[PDB]
Amino acid sequence: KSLSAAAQACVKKMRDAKVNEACIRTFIAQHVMVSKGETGSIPDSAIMPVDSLDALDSLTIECDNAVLQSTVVLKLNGGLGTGMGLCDAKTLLEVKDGKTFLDFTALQVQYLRQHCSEHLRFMLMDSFNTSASTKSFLKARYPWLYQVFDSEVELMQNQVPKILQDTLEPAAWAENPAYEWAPPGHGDIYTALYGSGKLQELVEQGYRYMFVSNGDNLGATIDKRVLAYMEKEKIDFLMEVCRRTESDKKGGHLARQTVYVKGKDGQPDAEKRVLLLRESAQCPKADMESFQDINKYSFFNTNNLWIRLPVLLETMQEHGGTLPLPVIRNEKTVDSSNSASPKVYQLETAMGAAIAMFESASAIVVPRSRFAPVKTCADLLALRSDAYVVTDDFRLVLDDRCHGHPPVVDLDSAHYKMMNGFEKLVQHGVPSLVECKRVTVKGLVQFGAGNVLTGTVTIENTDSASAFVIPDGAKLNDTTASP
Ligand SMILES: CC(=O)OC[C@@]1(C)C=Cc2c(c(C)cc3c2[nH]c2cc(O)ccc23)O1
C-alpha cells in the first residue's frame, strides 16, 4: 500500500467489519484528501452567483410512457424524526387519513404501474436504524414490494469510522463500539448503488433514468415534463432548485464556477460553466453574511435529482469504481453529547454535489410545492388538515380554497416541538384549516372535535400550569381565543 498507518488502520478496521470495498475505496480517498490539507471550505472568492436558469413552469410537453418503463424511483429513508422527538423511520409517520409518507409514494408507484408503466422500479435507501421497521411495514401493507425487498427494493447505507483530528486514526471508544462509526451523508447513494452491484444490474436491465428525493418530501413526485426536458436537451444530471426566501437564508445554495480550456495552437479558447453546492458547513465564518444574502445566491437544492444511470456508471468506472465528491469535514466529538471525548472528523458527502461531476449537468427552478418537507410538528398539522387533498394518482395538493398557499402554523416550541406534545393538541381531532390563512398556538391547548378555523386565528394560554380546552364544533373566525 501507499497509505499512511492511520489510513491503514482505517481500512483494516473496515475490512474486519465486512464493509464492502466500494465504501472503503471512497472513504480512503477522502481520508487521503484530508491528510493533504483539504478542509472542505468554499470561500466567496471561489464561486460566482448563478443568475439565469430554465423553469419547470415554462414547460408543457410530457414524455412517452416508454421512458417511464426505464425509470427508477429512489427515496431516501434513513431519517429518524429526532428533531420531533421520534425514534423510528420518519417515513412511517402518519401524515394524512391513516397513511404514511411511505404509503403515498408506494400508492403513487402502484398507480403508475397499472396505468402507465409496469416496469417502473421503486427503491428505498435505508439505514441500519430504519431497515427492520421498513421491512415489517411492507410485509403488512404492500406484499408485492415485500417479496422483492432484499433483492430489488432495499439499498443499504453503509457506515464509516470517525477519525481523530490529530492522527487521523480510527477513534476507539471503550464504553460503546457503536459511537465509533457514523453515516457518510446521502452522497453515499452512489457508493451504495455501485458497490452492491445494483447500478450495474439496473443499466443491464435497460433502466436509463433515476429520480431521487427525500422520503419525507411529499411534493417530490414523478413529473413527465422533466423526463422529456432531459431527453430533448440530452442532460445527464438535473437538480431541482427553488427560489430562496429569508426562511432559507441559513440553508445551502447553488453556485457557479467556470473552467477555461485553452485552445491548443491556433484555436478559440473554450468555456464551460460548472454548477456546485455550498452548504453552511462549507462556508467560512467570515463569509456567512454573503451566504445569507438571498439576492446574491437565490437558489437552493431541493434534493429532487434526476440522473441518467448509464452515464453515472461510466463516470464511476472511469474513477476506479467511485464518485469523488467534495468532502465535508465535520468537527465533532466521539461521544456527541460529551465534550470531554476526543475531537474527531466525521467525513460525509452530499448527493447534490454530484452536479459538478458531469459535463451535461443542469439545474431547473421548480415551484415550492415540489419541496414540501415535514420537519416540524407545525408542518404536520397543516398536512393533516383538509388544507391538503389527495388526488386520483395519490398525490397531495392544496385545496383550491387555499389560494395557492398552505395555512401558516406557528406552534409553541415549549409544548409542541415533540410529537407526544403535538398529539395531545389534536387528541380529539385536527381542525379544519382549509379556509385558514394563519393559526398560532401559545401555551397548553387542546382542540375539540369538528373545529373549523378561518382567517387568522391565535389561541394563547398564559398559565403554564393549566390546559385550555376548545369545545366540539367551535367556530373561530379572525380572533384571539383566550381563557
Ligand atoms: C419566492 C419566489 O420568488 O417565488 C418563487 C417560488 C418558486 C418560490 C417561492 C414560493 C413559491 C411558491 C409556489 C410557494 C411558496 C414560495 N415560498 C414560500 C414560502 C412559504 O413560507 C410558503 C409557501 C411558499 O414559488
The full 3-state SS of the chain, as one line of letters, equals CCCCHHHHHHHHHHHHCCCCHHHHHHHHHHHHHHCCCCCCCCCHHHCECCCCCEEHHHCCCCCCHHHHCCEEEEEEECCECHHHCCCCEHHHCEEECCEEHHHHHHHHHHHHHHHCCCCCEEEEEECCCCHHHHHHHHHHHCHHHHCCHHHHHEEECCCEECEECCCCCECCCCCCCCCCEECCCCCHHHHHHHHCCHHHHHHHHCCCEEEEEECCECCCCCCHHHHHHHHHHCCCEEEEEEECCHHHCCCCEEEEEEEEECCCCCCCCEEEEEEEEECHHHCCHHHHHHHCCCCCCCEEEEEEEEEEHHHHHHHHHHCCCCCCCCCEEEEEECCCCCCCCCEEEEEECCHHHHHHHCCCEEEEECCHHHCCECCCHHHHHHHHCCCEEECCCCCEEECCCCCCCCCEEEECHHHHCCHHHHHHHCCCCCCECCCEEEEEEECCEECCCCCEEEEEEEEECCCCCCCEECCCCCEEEEEEECC
- Annotated binding residues for UTP: 90, 157, 185, 216, 375
The three cell numbers of residue 414 are 415549549
Q: Residues annotated in the binding site for UDP-alpha-D-glucose, as ranges?
A: 78-79, 157, 185-186, 214-215, 250, 252, 279, 301, 303, 375
The answer to whether 261 and 272 are in contact (CB under 8 A) is yes
Residues 6+ apart with CB under 8 A from 52: none
Strands of the sheet with 343-348, listed across from one edge: 163-164, 343-348, 328-333
CB < 8 Å & 24+ apart, contacts of 284-290: 284/41, 284/43, 286/43, 287/43, 287/44, 290/44
Q: Select which of 224, 375, 417, 437 is catalytic.
A: 375
Q: Which of 301, 368, 374, 408 gets mutated to test ligand 1 (max ligand atoms within 8 A of its CB)?
A: 368
The residue out of 350, 374, 398 marking a domain boundary is 374
Torsion of CA 306, 364, 395, 244, to 10 degrees: 120
Domain count, the chain: 2
Pocket lining: 55 vs ligand 1, CB cutoff 6 Å: no
Our measurement of the distance from residue 352's CA atom to the centroid of its chain's CA atoms, rounded to an integer in Å, reads 9
Tell me how far the alpha carbon of residue 4 is from its chain's centroid. Answer: 35
Query: How many angstroms is it from 266 CA to the middle of ligand 1?
Result: 49
Same domain, 300 and 410: no
Phi and psi at residue 481, to the nearest 5°: -95, 125
Residues 380, 369: one domain?
A: no
CB 106 within 8 A of CB 142: yes
**Residue 249 annotated in active site:** no
Of 374, 396, 415, at which residue does a domain stop? 374
| Pair 367, 471 in one domain | no
Determine if ligand 1 sits within 6 Å of the CB of residue 183: no
472 and 339 share one domain:
no
Q: What is the resolution of this structure in A?
A: 2.3
Ligand 1 atom 18, closest CA = 368
Pairing, β 121-126 against β 160-161 = unpaired
CA of 367 to the centre of ligand 1 (A): 7
Do residues 422 and 433 both lie within one domain?
yes
**Residue position matching grid coordinates 446574491:** 296
Burial bucket for residue 256 (CB in 10 Å: 0-12, 13-18, 19+): middle
91 & 234 share domain: yes
Tell me: do 243 and 380 sit in the same domain.
Answer: no
Last residue of a domain, one of 317, 351, 374: 374
Question: Alpha carbon of 9 to those of 3, 16, 19, 188, 429: distances in Å?
Answer: 10, 11, 14, 22, 56
At 383, which CATH number?
2.160.10.10
- Its domain, for residue 415, covers 375-483
245 shares a domain with 335: yes
Torsion of CA 410, 412, 417, 418, to 10 degrees: -130
Task: Indicate whether 396 and 471 sit together in one domain.
Answer: yes
- Ligand 1 contact, 368 CB (< 6 A): yes
Which residues lie below 8 Å from residue 326, measured CB to CB, with a gap of 6+? Answer: 40, 276, 282, 349, 353, 356
CA dist., res. 387 & res. 298, Å (int): 28
| Cell numbers at 445, concatenated | 391547548
Cα Rg for the chain, rounded, in angstroms? 24
- Cα of 390 vs centre of ligand 1, distance in Å, is 21
CA nearest neighbour of 209 among 224, 227, 194: 227
Each residue of 142-155: b (16+ CB within 10 Å) or e?
beebbeebeeebbb
Question: For residue 291, which of 348, 243, 237, 253 has the smallest C-alpha distance?
Answer: 253
Q: How many Å apart are CA 476 and CA 462, to the nearest integer?
A: 19
Max distance between CA atoms of the chain, in angstroms, equals 83
The Å distance, Cα 224 to ligand 1 centre, comes to: 22
Residue 372 carries which side chain, given as an amino acid letter?
A
Atom of ligand 1 nearest to the CA of 242: 7
Name the residue of 53, 244, 245, 409 to mutate for ligand 1: max ligand atoms within 8 A of Cβ. 245
- Nearest CA to 361 out of 306, 403, 411 is that of 306
Query: Which long-range CB contacts under 8 A does 441-444 form with residues at least 24 apart?
Result: 441/410, 441/411, 441/412, 441/416, 442/412, 443/412, 443/415, 443/468, 444/415, 444/468
Say if ligand 1 is within 6 A of residue 243 CB. yes
Question: Which residues make Cβ contacts (< 8 Å) with residue 220, sequence separation at least 6?
Answer: 211, 213, 214, 302, 303, 304, 370, 371
Query: Using a 6 Å cutoff on CB, does residue 242 contact ligand 1?
Result: yes
Q: Do 311 and 431 belong to one domain?
A: no
User: Residue 469 forms beta bridges with which residues?
Assistant: 446
* Same domain as 321, residue 411: no
Q: How far, in Å, CA of 343 to CA of 331, rounded?
A: 7
Give the CATH number for residue 150.
3.90.550.10
189, 253: one domain: yes
Task: Find where cell 443499504 sits.
Answer: 156
- Neighbouring residues of 72: CB distance < 8 A, sequence distance ≥ 6: 120, 121, 122, 123, 202, 207, 209, 210, 211, 309
Amino acid code (one letter) for 354: A
